[PDB]
Write a protein that binds this DNA or RNA. Structure first.
Length: 441
RNA sequence: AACAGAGUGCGACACC
DNA sequence: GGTGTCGCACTCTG
């Protein structure tokens, strides 16, 4: 039905509006041959059929180059990645344009709740390399070659491709303004308001992409769904849920017995902190067991449990509405700041994110009252990363508006941040649910 | 043994 | 007590 745009059918891609790239070198560089690292029978055999599939496909061509860098295949078959730090250090740097994965969804309007997701197959290869630059990307072989397209391992590949595709799509975006199109480099979210208003765009877009010369995986496609996985998340109805996959990777593991094992834990669980109320404080007992003896007392096990429990009971987050205002409820506890950034849908405050930070050494040194102010300060700063300086009412269990206006060091800076009334208004003192951190009637 | 971007915790150097 | 630059963990997205 759409043979052109499906990699599985319409064959390898080529960004047609995109003219072959010429990679600008450092003003002082020099070709570098580098000994093809040894791999193994499984690695050599892993990317073996790939280096052969690409060859007769033109993407790969017989070459004789000063430069050699060793290819570094991977897996999850194998990827034809290529270890080339030596090259891309001899290559100049460019002002980047890759999206901020943190706030991309901030731009998904609740009006739009019909979703499609298209992952792009072999995106980088859709860009052509200009024969001048082709040699930089050479590697030995047996059964020396090089890339006619844009290879993985190359430091600019990510940005170069974002721009290419972003530019190629700037057309669409103005022409179907009734649709939303988020783009994280390689893969795309389309948002409609209607089951068919989605199936239009998903026809148009899916077409445009075939024309422009890009191809999308029909395997990984997610067409006109009411919920979709995107960026590690489940999106459904303008809310962001943690994936059961994500959870299993924590629940599943055995209680850490080394610092390394602890670090992996805090590592992956910390990627869920937006869904864990008073996270930072929760994990306080765990942190010192990194770097340092490893005594696993009750507090360690308490934290450990609490955190895992907090994942099972984890709530959906509301996607930030930038056309509305936000409230930030905040509390401070023994040197730890915690709070929930919320927005209203009718009669409901619905959390947009949970924010917590360990109070730094000096702050932590100040008395309870002052601590609350610093608590309010950091979380406000962090909330900014989501609100985009949209107007924010700050609420808390202890009144502090006065003190930030009439204190008897850092204040100067805190006052500056908190007393800009064009973005920050204190609200009334309120009582919070100790869990959920929401206000009590 | 590769890249870009992101989250958070810890340290080091320097500076009044 | 305050304040500026780095580096090293673990983790995630593609």
């Amino acid at each position: 039905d759409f043979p052109q745009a499906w990699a599985e059918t319409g064959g390898m891609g080529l960004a047609v509006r995109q003219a072959p790239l010429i990679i600008p070198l450092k003003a002082t560089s020099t070709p570098v041959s580098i000994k093809q690292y040894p791999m193994s029978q499984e690695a050599r055999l892993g990317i073996k059929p790939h280096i052969q599939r690409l060859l007769d496909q033109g993407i790969l061509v017989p070459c004789q180059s000063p430069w050699n860098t060793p290819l570094l295949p991977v897996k999850k078959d194998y990827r034809p990645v290529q270890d080339l730090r030596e090259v891309n250090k001899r290559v100049e740097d460019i002002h980047p344009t890759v999206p901020n994965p943190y706030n991309l969804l901030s731009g998904l309007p609740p009006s739009h709740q019909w979703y499609t997701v298209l992952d792009l197959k072999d995106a980088f290869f859709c860009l052509r390399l200009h024969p001048t630059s082709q040699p930089l990307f050479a590697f030995e072989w047996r059964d020396q070659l090089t890339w006619t397209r844009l290879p993985q391992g190359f430091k600019n590949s990510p940005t170069l491709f974002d721009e290419a595709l972003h530019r190629d799509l700037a057309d669409f975006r103005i022409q179907h303004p009734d649709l939303i199109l988020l783009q994280y480099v390689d893969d795309l979210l389309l948002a409609a308001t209607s089951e068919q208003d989605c199936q239009r765009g998903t026809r148009a877009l899916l077409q445009t992409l075939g024309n422009l010369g890009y191809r999308a995986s029909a395997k990984k496609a997610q067409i006109c769904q009411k919920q979709v996985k995107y960026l590690g998340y489940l999106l459904k109805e303008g809310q962001r849920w943690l994936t059961e996959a994500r959870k299993e990777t924590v629940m599943g593991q055995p209680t850490p017995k080394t610092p390394r094992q602890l670090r992996e834990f805090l590592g992956t669980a910390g990627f869920c902190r937006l869904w864990i109320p008073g996270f930072a404080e929760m994990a306080a007992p765990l942190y010192p067991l990194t770097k340092t003896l490893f005594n696993w007392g009750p507090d360690q096990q308490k934290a450990y449990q609490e955190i895992k429990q907090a994942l099972l009971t984890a709530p959906a987050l509301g996607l930030p509405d930038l056309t509305k205002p936000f409230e930030l409820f905040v509390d401070e506890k023994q040197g730890y700041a915690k709070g929930v950034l919320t927005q209203k849908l009718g009669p409901w405050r619905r959390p947009v994110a949970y924010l917590s930070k360990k109070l730094d050494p000096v702050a932590a040194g100040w008395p309870p009252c002052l601590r609350m102010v610093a608590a309010i300060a950091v979380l406000t700063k962090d909330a900014g990363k989501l609100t985009m300086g949209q107007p924010l009412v700050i609420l808390a269990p202890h009144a502090v508006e006065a003190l930030v206006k009439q204190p008897p060091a850092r204040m100067t800076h805190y006052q500056a941040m908190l007393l800009d009334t064009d973005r920050v208004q204190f609200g009334p003192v309120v009582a919070l649910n100790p869990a959920t951190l929401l206000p009590l009637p």
